[PDB]
Design a protein around this nucleic acid. Structure first.
Lengths: 87, 117, 96, 64
RNA sequence: CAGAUAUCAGGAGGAACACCGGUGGCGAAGGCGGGUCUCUGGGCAGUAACUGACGCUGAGGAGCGAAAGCGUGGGGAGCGAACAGGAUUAGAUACCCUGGUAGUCCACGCCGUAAACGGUGGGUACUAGGUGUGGGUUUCCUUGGGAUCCGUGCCGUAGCUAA
């Protein structure tokens, strides 16, 4: 899962500032890295069929926050988009 | 011949019959007596009277090989458990100990399905 | 790295004196690979509840290692290639 | 029985698989397992004891 | 009858995990239970630390999805369809016995239907209680008791239902 230390350093890296866990970019980074983690757990547990639901739920939450990022300010949206290399 | 001081009443107590195999402590059935051995077949093989008859015949063979002290090793449930027990008691083989030697597949193999008559 | 409380059952044939050097001669690789502090608690000459491999008594060994899962996995692979060992049990001290 | 537990109420005690004597106090003659509510103890202790008894039966220290 | 049954010992096989095993939990639902290890799923609880309405539903569409069945290669100890004899019977093809092939298990696939039902769609704000009951935390006696939030039963208010 999102280890308590890797999520914290990620929040420091891409978060808007310190202690601002839950900011849209912050959650995007956290869930993005969690998704990257599960990417290979599924590729070795080829028949897990049970963590994929959490995969999809977190993906949907990431997009549901991405839209809020874009609507408030497209600039930060693009910034994070090319920061994480999404699409 | 030979003499067996202590025997074991390995009673294959099927509902079909109680095959009373007396076994030396080595683990060899020195002799056995079932319902058919006395002469009971079919339903009479499964009658309670066949149980004491088989046990008594086995115990007579036991005395014939000088067997007096026997511990009772009864297998699965059948017709005449305690009946064969006190037959052996009254036929020269005191009870000693009673042990239900029944197989226990602890949720293991698959048997046939069932019967409805 | 995780704290693994490895339980080993050892032959009744050998002597208790040889029980331990055979134990550090296999814990050496664990220590050299994971840097694992080991607490070797050995108490032999105890019966088994059921006879195993035509034997119902043996030697009980408790070893508290702080080793990564890979290292204790290597140990289990080695804790069964030996004739003296009888049963191995590596436990995750976590809520697992 | 009928207490809060012998652990959740006595508020000091522990369960170990190596402590085969303490576990044996709850097992049957052959090692059969009491129901979830036979011994009157808080449920988590019952479940952990059950798993420990499974492991003990596997490791051949209790009458299986 | 050759040594069958049996008894002991041994080996082989294949499958499943009795007891724990239950309004008790978990899981979106089909489902989950021998033990170990690894990865991973989600929930609940106390601090707002933070984001600052990022809410819900959701046609199309998406996958998952009981069992069976078929494709591909194995397994098969047992069971066992189909198919075999014997038995009641007027008839057995049926109930019963005497066996066993695919299947049943595994691997990779197919399909998508089950009475796949709280027969009660998802989500949210209000309406007496009482009592079992899982997880938590707190608060009040000296563990004892209370509160709270979440899971899970039954009975019973209002009110509702044709009942």
């Amino acid at each position: 899962a999102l280890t308590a230390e890797q999520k914290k350093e990620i929040l420091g890296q891409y978060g808007l500032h310190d202690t601002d866990t839950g900011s849209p970019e912050a959650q995007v980074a956290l869930l993005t890295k969690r998704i990257q983690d599960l990417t290979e757990h599924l590729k070795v547990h080829k028949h897990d069929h049970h963590s994929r639901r959490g995969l999809l739920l977190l993906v949907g939450r990431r997009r549901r926050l991405l839209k809020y990022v874009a609507q408030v300010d497209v600039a930060r949206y693009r910034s994070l988009i090319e920061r994480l290399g999404l699409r | 011949k030979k003499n067996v001081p202590h025997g074991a009443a390995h009673i294959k107590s099927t509902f079909n019959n109680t095959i009373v195999s007396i076994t030396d402590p080595q683990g060899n059935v020195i002799a056995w007596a079932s319902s058919g051995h006395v002469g009971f077949k079919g339903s009479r093989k499964s009658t309670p009277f066949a149980a004491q008859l088989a046990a008594e015949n086995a115990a007579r063979k036991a005395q014939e090989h000088g067997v007096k002290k026997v511990d009772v090793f009864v297998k699965g449930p059948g017709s005449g458990r305690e009946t064969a027990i006190r037959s052996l008691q009254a036929a020269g083989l005191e009870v000693g100990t009673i042990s239900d030697v029944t197989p226990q597949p602890h949720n293991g193999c698959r048997p046939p399905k069932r019967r409805r008559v | 790295m995780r704290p693994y409380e490895i339980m080993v059952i050892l032959d009744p044939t050998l002597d208790e004196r040889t029980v331990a050097p055979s134990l550090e001669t296999f814990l050496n690789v664990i220590r050299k690979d994971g840097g694992t502090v080991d607490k070797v608690d050995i108490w032999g000459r105890r019966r088994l509840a059921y006879e195993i491999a035509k034997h119902a008594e043996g030697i009980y060994a408790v070893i508290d290692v702080k080793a990564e899962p890979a290292t204790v996995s290597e140990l289990d692979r080695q804790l069964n290639l030996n004739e003296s060992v009888l049963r191995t049990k590596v436990l995750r001290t976590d809520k697992h | 029985k009928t207490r809060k537990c012998v652990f959740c109420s006595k508020k000091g005690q522990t369960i170990d698989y190596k402590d085969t004597a303490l576990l044996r106090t709850y097992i049957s003659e052959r090692g059969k397992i009491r129901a979830r509510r036979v011994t009157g103890n808080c449920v988590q202790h019952q479940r952990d004891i059950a798993v420990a008894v499974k492991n003990a039966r596997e490791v051949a220290l209790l009458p299986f």
